[PDB]
Design a protein around this nucleic acid. Structure first.
Lengths: 437, 437
RNA sequence: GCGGAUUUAGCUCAGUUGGGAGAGCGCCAGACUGAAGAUCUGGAGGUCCUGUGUUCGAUCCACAGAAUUCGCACCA
RNA sequence: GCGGAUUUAGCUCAGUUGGGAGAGCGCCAGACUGAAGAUCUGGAGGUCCUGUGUUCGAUCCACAGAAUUCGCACCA
């Protein structure tokens, strides 16, 4: 669609200027006031300070640099003293060393105690690194901020922007590092088409090489992978979207695509036509952070997946959804019903000892030999994958993560077909089964 | 049941003396007459000559030794000339070098041209070896003939006596060699409990050792495995029956056990309770020898077995029966119905070339990535193992042996449940599923 | 008939994740030697038995066939 | 919290068919030496991280746990 046109029309949905821009300055000014009132060494960092934040994603990050001659707890008292007096409403978030989150004029503000540490390698944790992150990008990104926003937008539209585990996609800082390295969104897109699972981007030397994993080198600390949270699968998605974009560019790569919103009638048909067993594990949501839940949900999903493999219902895919109330573990298998009878692996014919024991056990059918080894017909306790998972969930809850497993242990349901379609899992089911529009 | 008593009561069902013993002598005498009438060098061998044949299993083996200074075809003319004149009704069976099979007074007689070859290593085929076989066992078996008959009886009662492929069990000559080696049936049974898949019995040296396969050394030619036809599985069966006999001896080890003879009503229930898919491939019997058909049937069964494994209906066992009219390939699977959808293995994400092609193909559902590799949902052409086999039989008949495959190629049926129970396959189905009485 | 095993470099053979065609020996060269050899380096060297099919992709999966090899035995 | 990787002989590590507990090094010995070393032979050497469970059978499969290790990050 001409390429450059859609790049510019995308900006009116990317660039903030819903006149929150000034609300930033207003809060900043106000923030700058009260802060200079207490004579503290302070820095504005993150999205706001570089004028790089997305439309609606307004956030002030304030990092309070504290003398390189104090102690952990002496900065503690301070961050509090300050945060409180400068913010309008507050909470305390402790991380690895605590910080104050609050609100100034409807703008989410992050008041954070730091160190006036000037120059790296003398770093203790991830927090003290962001000032340097800002420092290095400051002045080296000036002018190219729009191109960053395009990248972000591109990634958000297809749901791979973010460092949080719910996404495992691209971190903002990474995006910035990228735009810097290539020159613009596009020159990034072009080269991304040639990325591999072993492609390494050292921004510090301006060099591209092959390593062991996909690695983007932090120009501040060359021991740091900025793209550490980028999952294997997401990276590939990005690469493929870059190949798909260049060949036939369109604006639909920048619009966030919306729910397919189906009726139970069309979904049941798909299932029927698929001839697959579709079911889910429902259980109440344990009240914990997002960056804890999804990892557990994933682990939980995987084990059940692995289970149904062992018991040979042959699952296709697995999916998960977390509402404000419950959690759902979705599964589609190739086997609706398995036989009650199965092969039980018995001893080689020579080990008379073990033979007898194996034979001493009482069964409904005679054991036999095949390839110089005994085998026996025995009975399963479950015939459908629903029945099997029920057995598994009830007996092997503990392995399904700490909080998730406990929530299942205490209670769970298994929902099949028409009943399940009524649950808020429509979107993911379609995504799991790969339904067209 | 006392042990020795049942050994003696078994003999009245083992020792011939249904007064066919004299019919032997009568025919022998008559045979000896006409033969000496033509001045031929002749020998009586096999079961009859040693008085070792089973009750009802009466057969005269006559091997016509011919001068060690003739040629293949010059003996040929002779065997005929002789066979005809001495037998009452005849056929010609060609083997590797032909022979005359016929009847003298209702007794199946085998008139065979040989060589007066005295002493081995100058042998050409299996036929010229039997005189030496008889020669070596003659006089070294005298007195111990009853003990041989016990062994035979033991093996026949449980259906592992015979060198023909329908059985793949113990050859008579082998049994004799055994009784000779240990001393009696029992001393054979005791030691057989300690046989392995690598136990070697050299009768010539009177020695037991370990080799590579189960090997019984022919005292005549030490390059010959007498137990070559003994299948792995049958050997084990024998060994296990020897262990089972010594621990609790009973006469039921000598009675041939009879059909379980079931109704369709009890069989359907078992199937239902088993929850398994049971079906068979029916097709007309190609008119060929037994030692050709069963090998093919086996091969045929196996491939179908292997197929259902590939397509994951997960078969349990496989069985075959050959009537005077049709042949049956019986199968029991763990999967009655499989989903219409399956995983299609696609390329790794890097090989852009192959990616596109894989994606160019049209499907009902979107392809995806998992572990850096593309996968696609596609449709099977069959949902039940019956449907699948139908597809397989029709497309892959040729591999199912020469004659068998051709018979299926031209025609076949697949029969399920109630319909199949009406077919003469009741016994084997019970044997395949391991049903109790 | 019949069945199993085998078929990848000149020789002898590995090769299982369906994506890299390999080792040893032989041959050529380099290093080393006074020489040659022995050792270390390296290089060249291919109809993965043939055909067709399955697959995005084939030494590998399927079918047909070929060749080598061992045995099976019918006979009964 | 949160996740992954790892845990087999004194050290460093193989170990995939669920049935044999292994290699290299180290140590002792034999052979060889004038000696010792170097090489070849061999031997000893084990809580397969623990527990419980599955199985005829447990390094291998399942659950709980431990320890080592790397990273995840929430924060928003």
């Amino acid at each position: 669609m001409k390429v450059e046109e859609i790049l510019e029309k995308a900006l009116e949905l990317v660039i903030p200027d819903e006149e929150e821009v000034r609300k930033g300055r207003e809060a900043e000014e106000e923030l700058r006031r009260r802060l200079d009132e207490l004579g503290v060494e302070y820095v504005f960092v993150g999205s706001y300070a570089r004028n790089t934040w997305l439309k609606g994603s307004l956030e002030i990050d304030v990092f309070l640099l504290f003398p390189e001659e104090f102690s952990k707890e002496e900065l503690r008292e301070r961050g509090l003293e300050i945060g409180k007096a400068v913010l309008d409403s507050y909470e305390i978030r402790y991380a690895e060393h605590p910080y104050v989150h609050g609100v100034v004029k409807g703008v989410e503000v992050d008041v954070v105690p730091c160190y006036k540490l000037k120059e790296p390698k003398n770093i203790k944790s991830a927090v003290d690194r962001t000032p340097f992150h800002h420092k290095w990008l400051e002045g080296r990104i000036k002018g190219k901020e729009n191109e960053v926003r395009l990248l972000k937008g591109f990634l958000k539209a297809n749901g791979i922007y973010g460092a949080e585990y719910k996404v495992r996609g691209f971190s903002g800082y990474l995006c910035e590092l990228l735009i810097v390295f290539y020159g613009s969104f596009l020159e990034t897109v072009k080269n991304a088409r040639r990325w591999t699972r072993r492609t390494v981007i050292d921004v510090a030397k301006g060099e591209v090489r092959k390593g062991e994993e996909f690695f983007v080198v932090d120009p501040v600390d060359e021991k740091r992978n900025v793209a550490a949270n980028l999952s294997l699968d997401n990276l590939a998605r990005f690469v493929h979207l870059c190949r798909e974009f260049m060949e036939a560019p369109s604006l639909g790569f920048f619009k966030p695509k919306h729910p397919l919103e189906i009726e139970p009638e069309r979904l049941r048909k798909i299932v029927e036509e698929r001839g697959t067993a579709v079911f889910a594990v429902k259980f109440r949501k344990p009240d914990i952070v997002d960056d804890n839940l999804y990892p557990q949900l994933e682990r939980a999903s995987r084990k059940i997946f692995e289970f149904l493999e062992r018991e040979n219902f042959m699952p296709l895919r697995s999916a998960f959804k977390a509402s404000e109330e419950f959690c759902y573990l979705l599964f589609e298998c190739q086997i609706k019903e398995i036989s009650r009878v199965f092969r039980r692996m018995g001893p080689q014919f020579e080990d008379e000892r073990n033979v007898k024991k194996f034979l001493s056990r009482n069964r409904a059918f005679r054991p036999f030999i095949e390839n110089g080894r005994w085998w026996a017909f025995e009975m399963r306790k479950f015939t459908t994958p629903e029945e099997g998972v029920r057995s598994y969930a009830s007996t092997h809850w503990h392995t399904l993560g700490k909080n998730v497993g406990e929530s299942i242990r205490e209670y769970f349901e298994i929902i099949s077909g028409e009943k399940l379609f009524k649950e808020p899992v429509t979107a993911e089911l379609c995504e799991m089964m790969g339904v067209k529009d």
